[PDB]
Copies of this chain bind each other. A is one copy, B any other.
Amino acid sequence: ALFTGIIPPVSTIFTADGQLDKPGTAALIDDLIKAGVDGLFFLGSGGEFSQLGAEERKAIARFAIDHVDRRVPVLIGTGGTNARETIELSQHAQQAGADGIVVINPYYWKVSEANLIRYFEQVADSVTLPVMLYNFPALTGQDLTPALVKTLADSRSNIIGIKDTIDSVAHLRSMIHTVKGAHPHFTVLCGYDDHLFNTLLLGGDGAISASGNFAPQVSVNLLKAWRDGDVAKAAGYHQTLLQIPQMYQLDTPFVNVIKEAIVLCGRPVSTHVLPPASPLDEPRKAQLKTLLQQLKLC
């Protein structure tokens, strides 16, 4: 099984001019690797892919992949509405030395199931790289059901996992049973912090979640405990992870929260986010601080 464990959706750090902050992004990558994460996912939802252009995405992926310099596995999110661009971005990631790609379903038109299967088979066929599906139905308006994912796993041997982003035990349980019952080594990662423990107890593989950025040690330690057979210890970390997502309510989009949390937990970076996101105000920044306090994360 590929891309198991704790794989944070890394924030892209920008300067006040809205340009890739290389020193800041590099420093975050290095903090993460040292914290013992199992890989790194650039240009996910939290990486701000949907607010960046194609050439910015390429320059960021290239910088990120080069800086990681093969210390851990690197995933690049290459999805969008423009299918020709998805292929372009996917082929670029392979060429640039990425280890896999993460592909969201098209999220403007909710395309027919025939067109959807066709779309994923086309992007899978454009690269020799492993492909991770990305389900985030709150944003897309179109669920990748366990049956559809099994159909895709059946069709293409490089479709090898899913980031399932949903506040639903049922969806995760059903994803694991249906897809991993057919394909034991297909990887299921939850996209929310507070589902990581259940995902592992269900037979899934880890998490790609926001708190990987500012509190990686919690998910890293939970995974270690679980793999060590120390379930009480794992549950202690899960208790923290249960409370973290309160902070995400502070703004929508909450990419600003995540970066402000990185700063508060001890890594000074610029916290600039791209429009239509906006800076987090001082009150809500203070609120974020007391929440991290109250969880001993800072």
Complex interface: chain B residues within 8 A of A141 (CB) = 139, 141
**Of the residues B84, B168, B238, contact of A51 by C-beta under 8 Å:** B84
Contacts of A202 on B, CB cut-off 8 Å? 242-243
Instruction: Indicate with 1 or 0, residue by residue over A181-205, a CB within 8 angstroms of chain B CB atoms.
Output: 0000000000010110010011000
Q: Verify A111–B168 contact, CB threshold 8 A.
A: no
* CB contact between A54 and one of B53, B116, B275 (< 8 Å): that residue: B53
User: Taking the complex as formed, is A63 at the interface, i.e. its CB lies under 8 A from any CB of chain B?
Assistant: no
Give the distance in Å from the alpha carbon of A106 to the alpha carbon of B275 in the complex.
10
Range of interface residues on chain A? 35 or more
Cross-chain contact of A112 among B18, B177, B234, B251 (Cβ < 8 A)? B251
Q: Is the CB of B115 within 8 A of A276?
A: yes
In the bound complex, how far is the Cα of B9 from the Cα of A5, in angstroms? 38
Q: Which residue in B109, B195, B232 is a CB contact (below 8 Å) of A276? A: B109
Q: Mark A48-63, 1 if CB is under 8 A from B, else 0.
A: 0011111000000000
Minimum CB–CB distance for A291 against chain B, Å: 11
Residues facing B in A47-79 (CB within 8 A) are 50-54
Give the residue of B109, B195, B274, B276 whose beta carbon is less than 8 angstroms from that of A169: B195
Q: Are the CB atoms of B170 and A168 closer together than 8 Å?
A: no
What 1/0 mask marks residues of chain A from 268 to 282 whose CB sits below 8 Å from any chain B CB? 000000111110000
At the interface, yes or no: A97 with Cβ under 8 Å from chain B?
Answer: no
Residues of B within 8 A of A84 (CB): 18, 51, 53, 274-275
Bound Cα distance from A141 to B140, whole angstroms: 8
B residues within 8 A CB of A83?
51, 274-276
B170 to A169, Cβ gap below 8 A? no
CB-defined contacts of A115 to chain B, threshold 8 Å: 251-253, 276-278
Which of B53, B112, B195 is the one whose CB lies under 8 Å from A252? B112
Task: Check A111 against B235 for contact (C-beta < 8 Å).
Answer: no
CB distance from A137 to the nearest CB of B (A): 9
- Are A52 and B82 in touch, CB under 8 angstroms? yes
- Top 8 A-B pairs, shortest CB-CB distance: A83-B275, A232-B232, A50-B81, A50-B108, A119-B276, A231-B232, A112-B252, A109-B253
